[PDB]
Amino acid sequence: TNEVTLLDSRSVQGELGWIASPLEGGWEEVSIMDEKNTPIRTYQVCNVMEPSQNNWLRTDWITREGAQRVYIEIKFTLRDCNSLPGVMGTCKETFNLYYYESDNDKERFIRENQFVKIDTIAADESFTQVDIGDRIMKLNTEIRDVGPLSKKGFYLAFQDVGACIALVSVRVFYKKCPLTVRNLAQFPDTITGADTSSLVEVRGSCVNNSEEKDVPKMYCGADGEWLVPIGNCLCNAGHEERSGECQACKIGYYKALSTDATCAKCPPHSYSVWEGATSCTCDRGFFRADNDAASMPCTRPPSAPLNLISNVNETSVNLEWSSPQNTGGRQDISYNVVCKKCGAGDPSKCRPCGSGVHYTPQQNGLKTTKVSITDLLAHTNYTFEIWAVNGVSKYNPNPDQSVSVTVTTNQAAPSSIALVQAKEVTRYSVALAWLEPDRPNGVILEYEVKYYEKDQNERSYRIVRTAARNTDIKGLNPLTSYVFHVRARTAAGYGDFSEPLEVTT
Amino acid sequence: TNEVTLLDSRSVQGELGWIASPLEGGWEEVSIMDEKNTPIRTYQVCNVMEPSQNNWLRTDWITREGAQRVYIEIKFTLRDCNSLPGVMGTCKETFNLYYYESDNDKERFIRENQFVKIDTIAADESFTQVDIGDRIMKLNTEIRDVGPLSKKGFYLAFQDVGACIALVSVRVFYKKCPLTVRNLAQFPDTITGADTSSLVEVRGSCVNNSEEKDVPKMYCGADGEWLVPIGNCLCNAGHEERSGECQACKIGYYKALSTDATCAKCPPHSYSVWEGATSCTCDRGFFRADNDAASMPCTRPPSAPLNLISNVNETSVNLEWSSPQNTGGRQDISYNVVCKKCGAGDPSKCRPCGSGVHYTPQQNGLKTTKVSITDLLAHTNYTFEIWAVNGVSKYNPNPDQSVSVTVTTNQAAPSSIALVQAKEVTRYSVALAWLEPDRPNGVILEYEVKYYEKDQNERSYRIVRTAARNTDIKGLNPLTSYVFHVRARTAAGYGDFSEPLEVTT
Amino acid sequence: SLEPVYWNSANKRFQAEGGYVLYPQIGDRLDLLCPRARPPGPHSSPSYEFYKLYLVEGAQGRRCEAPPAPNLLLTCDRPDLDLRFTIKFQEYSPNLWGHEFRSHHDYYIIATSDGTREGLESLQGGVCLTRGMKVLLRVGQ
Amino acid sequence: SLEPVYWNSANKRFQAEGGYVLYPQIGDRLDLLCPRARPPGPHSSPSYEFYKLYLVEGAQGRRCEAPPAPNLLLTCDRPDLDLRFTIKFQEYSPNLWGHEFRSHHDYYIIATSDGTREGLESLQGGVCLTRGMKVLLRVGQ
């Protein structure tokens, strides 16, 4: 069922009306009831007692339909000649099959010498009695082929030389490679090659919703089927693998690049797009970077570092801060320092830093958490806004808040605490009380306390930051003498060590 | 000639001695002189007048040699029965071909029902007269195949049913795909598949002097030949394309990477290596860089820039130089500035610049031809060695010479020339004479002269550098008034403009 | 020679004296036709008459009675199409049953259907009796 | 029946009275052998004797004389190998020349070589005369 009929004598319901030499007394046309219980048109001859038989039968012109190799199926029966009255001898058990290529579709006469012999066809089996009821499959079936054919069409001829023979059906056909979709590429119906040692190169076009990555090709063999598939057509961006054509990604699925893998679900914090989307769009408040990959989720905007430590010099100012609380989901974290000059004067409104402010580490977008500003005018009050910048923050709206600190230029550093005192003394905790230093030289913001064990090797100093003038120690072993040192910290500068208080647990 | 014989009755010189039923009066063995004028062993039977013929002939056991599909070539002739005395009727023109698979190589008897019918074979042509002299090719040739075969070997049998027939030769063979080298990969001899619709996947190993880039494979068809070649084996580094195996590069040829292109000749200034070299080695005085490609020639070392212009300030010094004379063949040209402090004091020996000398453009390896050195101590004499560095210069030995200039810190720059004078006045040339400036402040190295036309729009200043105190103008139009300005140039600094001398041609 | 046998009531060669007797020669052809009778041309009848024609032993032919598993020659199913069947009085045939024509014997081509779609499979004298639709065949010695 | 004809001097059936006459029956086979005579087994001769055997018209057979383009049956080239040739007195044969055996006619299998490699192509009585190496064949009526 993979072969196109160029002629089937069984399809003719009126008459074949093929030309025959002689026209009477040789091949003759008669109907039969066939295997399928259907009346068909047949040709027969049985001049077994007559010598020197040369009975020619010739079909109408058959079009090739451009197929260079054509197959000829002949189903025939041979009546056993010794079943006929008088006929004593050896039976003729063969006939000869010929062909003639012609553009002319109305050849008038059988020109014997112009026909080319395909083969002598032999009856595998003969019969002596006609079949009455149900058709038993004892007919002979012989297939031959001819080609390469050059002309528009051709004639088949049969030569009988004295057999008792009936051609039950003649079927002329070509094979063919069927229309199949393999490796996500369409292949059309192609006819078989003229020679068995010759292969047909078949290159078919890919699906409309797919791009050709590798050149697709198939080899249509003589048997009527492809051999080795070479070159695969990968599905386009926003289309997955399917039985037929590349099916688009469903609502809530994306495909950025042409990959063999199926459509992946939208990343966290991303709005669902319509059927057949390239990338899942980000909802309000979230934005994706240009350099950042489509696989990465939408980011969140960064947070400003809550704590800010500031130390001042005669003309320069040093700033330090910790890592941000909410990263957002990006490794590229930068910091932008903005000069304001809003510290000078009581009102809120001020003039911007129009003058050339020089800061040695980086101007804008520093990766390090420490910066140093130089060439600042003395006796004038200043304020700096350390604004955290992410890779997405440019595409994202400007972050609501940025942690800033107001500083002074000419004003010094704070002095040391006159005396410290222990309030409560227990085996687990020791309370500490202290007053503010004699000379503040600025607004007090923090108090740092240091702890170090005596009678043993110098252990790493314990750091406890408290803005309040009172703090309590926690988790200490009994009978361990400890030295406590307090230090006042301001935005204006660095303080000095307090009174060394040696208290035994 | 691509097929292995499992049996040829023509090769037997004594006798075939095949078993026959009946052993006498049926098939019989006789010799003939064949087409090749060679005596061969044949089998024949001609019991055409006798009814109910059932004459069996059976070969000796034939080994498959493990080939599941085997081809059977029978060359035979049919004597026209009506050429025989008395025989009036229709001639038997066929015989039947059978086979029987067996592990047993000595089956005693012909067991008729155990044989399987391959086909009824028909005589395309018959003859009436024996050929006397030269053998005319009018024998019938019929080929059939059997398989897949399961057992060690098999028997062929022929059934005659009353023909006048001679089996001239019987040839049993299998096909095979020959040993061929295509796409620079070896393929071994492979047997044909058991079915016509089945292809054999053949994967052969590549040449010893070649690396497998793509997996090589061929498809051995039923006809005894490969179909589509897939995967090419590229020749190894230091081996070119050839008819057989990958031939190595000749004396004075190299191949760094596995490319389809042939061995290229050694690059300029490179020593010739032995047969089959990866890369042409560089001779004494020339060395190739690790990061640099094998295709690039061996480098020459760079040259130092002959001219050096130096201008001095109160504490800083500016340096400028031109492009090098001999490039060597590399685009990556850098300059290294070396501090010496050898200028201070009369003796040759000195102390190196141990102090932190700051130079704003680059420290070492500057691509620009202009550099500026700052923070140099006043009243102290200095000297800088501008050493040209190439990409190869590290691997290459240290270049013999580097152009250097000695400068002064506190000393002013040179003063201006008091007065200039014209010696000769002609329509083509005007000679110029001048004295050295009143205050030199260093050793005079060059004098720059500027020319500009009056009464017309300002033309580009003519530059003429002369170390001598005399110069002559060339190629000037008559009646053109010109203003001449001289400027004294030293390594210590930049000079001032001289007396404006307005001389008419 | 032998004329086409048209198989409908419109024939009337049936309602004839002796009763439609053909004497075919060895070598003669014969056609039995069931003409359209839909777009009604010549030779067709008032309306399409559904028949099955059997070749019968002559003894049974008289009795107007097909034997079991009869020798069905032609089946006029299709009122749309012209149907035909051709015999040649010869030893070869696309027939696979191995039937044979004794000489000096009588055979009948009979139709035992009443000529209706529902009476089609009838195997015992229908129109064969009714309209006398049978044909005797006496084949040359 | 018919015995193998060994073609060397060692035979001696040649040096016999009547002169080696066979009377083959229609249907009879016949073998002519040129036995090794290298590793010298039975039936072989003193040394290998190089012969060409022709089938001859009988008239020419007597005259010990092959005609031009003769009917060469067997050629004893090879002293290494046993050679043979078989006839069957029958209508079929792997022979393509269309020769025929009149009944009631005399045919001779003769060797006109002197039995030497250099005398091989001789077409006129050699050992046929010398050692009387011919065989008359009178084939059943």
Curated annotation (Swiss-Prot), chains A, B:
GO annotation, biological process: adherens junction organization; adult walking behavior; axon guidance; cell adhesion; cellular response to amyloid-beta; cochlea development; corticospinal tract morphogenesis; ephrin receptor signaling pathway
Effect of G343E: In a bladder carcinoma NOS sample; somatic mutation
Tissue spec. comment: Ubiquitous.
Catalysed reactions, semicolon-separated: L-tyrosyl-[protein] + ATP = O-phospho-L-tyrosyl-[protein] + ADP + H(+)
Domain Fibronectin type-III: 301-412, 413-505
Extracellular side: 1-505
Main location: membrane
Molecular functions (GO terms): amyloid-beta binding; ATP binding; DH domain binding; ephrin receptor binding; GPI-linked ephrin receptor activity; identical protein binding; kinase activity; PH domain binding
Enzyme Commission designation: 2.7.10.1
Residues with glycosylation annotation: N208, N313, N381
Cellular component GO terms, alphabetical: adherens junction; axon; axon terminus; axonal growth cone; cell surface; cytoplasm; dendrite; dendritic shaft
Keywords per UniProt: ATP-binding, Cell adhesion, Cell junction, Cell membrane, Cell projection, Developmental protein, Endosome, Glycoprotein, Kinase, Membrane, Neurogenesis, Nucleotide-binding, Phosphoprotein, Postsynaptic cell membrane, Receptor, Repeat, Signal, Synapse, Transferase, Transmembrane, Transmembrane helix, Tyrosine-protein kinase
Domain Eph LBD stretches: 3-182
Subcellular location: Cell membrane; Cell projection, Axon; Cell projection, Dendrite; Postsynaptic density membrane
UniProt superkingdom: Eukaryota
Lipid bilayer topology: Single-pass type I membrane protein
Record note on domains: The protein kinase domain mediates interaction with NGEF.
Family statement drawn from the similarity comment of this UniProt entry: Belongs to the protein kinase superfamily. Tyr protein kinase family. Ephrin receptor subfamily.
The protein's role, per its UniProt record: Receptor tyrosine kinase which binds membrane-bound ephrin family ligands residing on adjacent cells, leading to contact-dependent bidirectional signaling into neighboring cells. The signaling pathway downstream of the receptor is referred to as forward signaling while the signaling pathway downstream of the ephrin ligand is referred to as reverse signaling. Highly promiscuous, it has the unique property among Eph receptors to bind and to be physiologically activated by both GPI-anchored ephrin-A and transmembrane ephrin-B ligands including EFNA1 and EFNB3.
Quaternary assembly: Heterotetramer upon binding of the ligand. The heterotetramer is composed of an ephrin dimer and a receptor dimer. Oligomerization is probably required to induce biological responses. Interacts with CDK5, CDK5R1 and NGEF; upon activation by EFNA1 induces NGEF phosphorylation by the kinase CDK5. Interacts with CHN1; effector of EPHA4 in axon guidance linking EPHA4 activation to RAC1 regulation.
Designated name of the protein: Ephrin type-A receptor 4
Residue window of the full protein shown: 28 to 532 of 986
From Swiss-Prot, chains C, D:
Subcellular localization: Membrane
Origin superkingdom: Eukaryota
Positions of the Ephrin RBD domain: 1-139
Disulfide-bond pairs as recorded: C34-C76, C64-C128
Distribution of this protein across tissues and organs: Highly expressed in brain; expressed in embryonic floor plate, roof plate and hindbrain segments.
Extracellular side: 1-141
Family: Belongs to the ephrin family.
Protein function: Cell surface transmembrane ligand for Eph receptors, a family of receptor tyrosine kinases which are crucial for migration, repulsion and adhesion during neuronal, vascular and epithelial development. Binds promiscuously Eph receptors residing on adjacent cells, leading to contact-dependent bidirectional signaling into neighboring cells. The signaling pathway downstream of the receptor is referred to as forward signaling while the signaling pathway downstream of the ephrin ligand is referred to as reverse signaling. May play a pivotal role in forebrain function. (Microbial infection) Acts as a receptor for nipah virus and hendra virus.
Quaternary structure note: Interacts with GRIP1 and GRIP2. (Microbial infection) Interacts with nipah virus and hendra virus glycoprotein.
Protein name: Ephrin-B3
